[PDB]
């Protein structure tokens, strides 16, 4: 598991990093 | 969704990857 | 206002903040 | 896509809103 | 300043205001 | 909100309300 909760910009930027060139989709639910 | 999994709860790298395009 | 220059995380976070509850989709292209 | 529109060129709010879900 | 960098500057400001807490879209 | 703070100047107190 990841080490911490990821909320808001922290979660958006985690997805941004992890998904890289594939890109991602974010729905705040 | 990903907020419930990763913000309310604690998630895994695999769960984050599920939201890659 | 005038058109904006947005790159990298600035662009991703702009989309986060503009789209709000709708969420967004991001592919770096 | 949005990088070409907002990083290579400059883009409007309306163009960002086109990438909302 | 460069009005083409307002959004960019806003995101930078939120980063420094909220520091390590992170930020979200609603107040 | 990008609309408000780029159609006006936003204070510190207003930015803090967006923090997690």
Swiss-Prot record, chains A, C:
Location of this fragment in the whole protein: 25 to 53 of 110
Q: Which species is listed as the source?
A: Homo sapiens
Q: What superkingdom heads the lineage?
A: Eukaryota
Q: What is this protein called?
A: Insulin B chain
Transmembrane segment boundaries: none
**What happens on changing residue 22 to Q?**
In MODY10; reduces binding affinity to INSR; reduces biological activity; reduces folding properties
Q: What is the effect of changing residue 24 to S?
A: In HPRI; Los-Angeles
